[PDB]
Design a protein around this ligand. Structure first.
Ligand SMILES: Cc1ncc(COP(=O)(O)O)c(C/N=C(\C=C\OCCN)C(=O)O)c1O
Ligand SMILES: Cc1ncc(COP(=O)(O)O)c(C/N=C(\C=C\OCCN)C(=O)O)c1O
Lengths: 400, 401
């Protein structure tokens, strides 16, 4: 019999986590308004369909379009030379691709907790790079401290792991929260001192609720004119989340480093975007009058939905983190828990899954330093399916 | 200052292959590309193996795994069954080949690959994966086909130098040779793989472009009859739409693997290189349609064949003998005894005269790792009727002087 590679038989792909085991129970009997109203409702998949009718109602080289549409998201606060854009088949493809370019097998990336539980696959699986978690907690809304960067750096060098860059998510999945200007430039400054790359995964940037509150790492870069420090940062964007077009698989790497783009271009061979979809999204994304209209209404709609989910959970006795972005909220069932530990979280999540019939991302899958938090998505469902889901959790709390 | 950021070994590695002749030709092509009206004296591209001879049929025409399975069945002529549940879509074949290599081999382990091969394997297989290639050596003494003795030879090479070997990756039909592999050598190679306990990977990307349906033998043909699960799970097939359909920008390649354990790892690993669902949706009905895919593949086979005929007949009455080919989008022509120095440097110097003086891009055999000096791949399917007769008349009147 034939063996396969270490990588092949490695269980770093992550299909044993809670995250997936939820998706499996969802399919066992998915919710349906007419035909299965007691069925399980999906709130663990961070997808955006609240603004889809606008694209749908629309449709009755391409780098330039992608550059505009990025400019429009950031509000002329960035310039984006279409010649540095490198198309890759989704962000998951961009993040991995960068990691090959930015780190050796066994070297590391610092990643603030909580993070996208899917990084455990993307960054690690084929690349051989490790993650060292930068530890963050609810004492400051889970934001990156200059001391917790140093702490997590020392962790790596304590164990002979070279560190090669830090990969934040801006705005943060799962926190649903922008990072403040002041912490970005603080982090960039950390990167020149340690001589590493800053990777910004700006995938939720059209889904930040108020345009003024979002600070892209592009904002902190084309003003500071040292080529040495410019070439550390790189931006990873995709259409998957803002446009809600995740199956079209268009992500990009915009990198402020001449040497990356041309390696990233050659490396894109392995993960190209279908030219047919490039062609057919070109005019739309290029069209200022539309992208302006779209992003304004998307911001609002996502915001207005966030409001109803936290108000719902408020008058049922659940306080969420003060969020201003993303397609989800980061709700606290800390002091609403049995055992106050990791096993207690996984046991509570199994009651939510089996009894509420409700899929929710548990904080332990996100590597949260703190026990008892949960990501609940809201943008992959109707108005009505949310009020059902809220009424399900409202009347679960009644039984206390 | 002096506080500059390094990149990875892989990043600064020159295994991406943009120093070869292959690319340096593409760069001189752009300097002034050929154009019938605008500028004919311009350089003609015969180094890019692309198919546009049968495109007007798709143009005049216009889950999804089921379509891809049918279309593959139609290419092989019901000689394969293809469970759509084993198909794993990847963004092109270059993405499939790499993806498999991660699944089939560790960093520093090897793959045996018969020479000559797609010079782009030097990137695909090696670059991110850390695997090496050991060439299986083939020569014109038997039309560059794989011998059981040259497999053993190239295996020993690896084990001589402590390189574990993990599978062999043939191209069927062969790029650049333009030539099918015979049934007898495939099953001979499959037998080699059970004895050494390795995988056989078949890159069947040119399979709709083999000229006569009866002459092509897929590794799928040699497998669903032999019913040992042990030996079945060694082979894997890599196909794409890029070359037969001539739809290379839509980036749809697939891995069909006869190994339960691969498909589910290959599926999870496809995350990194997915096919746009929009193109999947819009190619679905077409590829599913038997009446059309039958008609298409018959005419494509013929058209590619009829073009091959004119290119070798052209080169014949100008004194160039090509290899007897029956497939692909190219021919493997011999300028061995039509050369100055008879060595690698002599080939690269001859190719620079063809590029600068003929104004003609042609893949030199040295880029393809050919064991033998002086051969060249010349593509023909990425150009009109007329641009070929110009290119032929250019080489005809070079031989005159
Ligand atoms: C920060 C971040 N980066 C990248 C991606 C990948 O998206 P791409 O452009 O490659 O489609 C996601 C999607 N994360 C959500 C997952 C979506 O579906 C994939 C399922 N694992 C989630 O639930 O957090 C994300 O949240
Ligand atoms: C054996 C083999 N494998 C893989 C590929 C990659 O094709 P994909 O399915 O990824 O589109 C090619 C095409 N090789 C040609 C390259 C074509 O370039 C495409 C330009 N976009 C060549 O010149 O040899 C090939 O001959």
């Amino acid at each position: 019999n034939v063996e396969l590679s270490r990588v092949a038989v490695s269980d770093t792909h992550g299909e044993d986590s809670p995250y997936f085991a939820g998706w499996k129970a969802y399919d066992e009997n998915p919710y349906d308004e007419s035909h299965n109203p007691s069925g399980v409702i999906q709130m663990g998949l961070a997808e955006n369909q609240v603004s889809f009718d606008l694209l749908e109602t629309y449709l009755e080289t391409f780098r330039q379009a992608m550059a505009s549409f990025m400019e429009q998201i950031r509000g002329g606060k960035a310039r984006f030379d279409p010649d540095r854009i490198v198309l890759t088949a989704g962000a998951t493809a961009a993040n991995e691709l960068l990691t090959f370019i930015l780190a050796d097998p066994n070297d590391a990336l610092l990643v603030p907790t909580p993070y996208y539980p899917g990084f455990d696959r993307d960054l690690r699986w084929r690349t051989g790079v490790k993650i060292v978690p930068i530890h963050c907690d609810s004492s400051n809304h889970f934001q990156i401290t200059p001391e917790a960067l140093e702490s997590a750096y020392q962790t790596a060098r304590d164990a002979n792991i070279r560190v090669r860059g830090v990969l934040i998510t801006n705005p943060s999945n799962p926190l649903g929260a922008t990072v403040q200007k002041k912490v970005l430039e603080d982090l960039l400054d950390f990167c020149v001192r340690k001589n590493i790359h800053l990777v910004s995964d700006e995938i939720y940037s059209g889904s930040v609720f108020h345009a003024s509150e979002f600070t892209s790492v592009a904002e902190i870069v084309e003003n500071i004119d040292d080529v040495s420090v410019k070439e550390r940062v790189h931006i990873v964007y995709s259409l998957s989340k803002d446009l809600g077009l995740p199956g079209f698989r268009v992500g990009t790497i915009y990198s402020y480093n001449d040497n990356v783009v041309r390696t990233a271009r050659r490396m894109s061979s392995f993960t190209l975007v279908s030219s047919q979809t490039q062609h057919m999204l070109a005019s739309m994304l290029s069209d200022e009058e539309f992208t302006e209209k779209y992003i304004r209404i998307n911001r609002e709609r996502l915001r207005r939905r966030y409001d109803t989910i936290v108000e719902g959970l408020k008058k049922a006795g659940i306080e969420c983190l003060k969020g201003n972005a993303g397609l989800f909220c980061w709700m606290n069932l800390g002091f609403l828990l049995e055992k106050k530990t990791k096993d207690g979280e996984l046991q509570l999540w199994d009651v939510i899954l089996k009894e509420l019939n409700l899929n929710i991302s548990p904080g332990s899958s996100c590597h949260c330093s703190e026990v008892g938090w949960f990501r609940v998505c809201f943008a992959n469902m109707s108005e009505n399916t949310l009020e059902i889901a809220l009424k399900r959790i409202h009347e679960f709390m009644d039984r206390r």
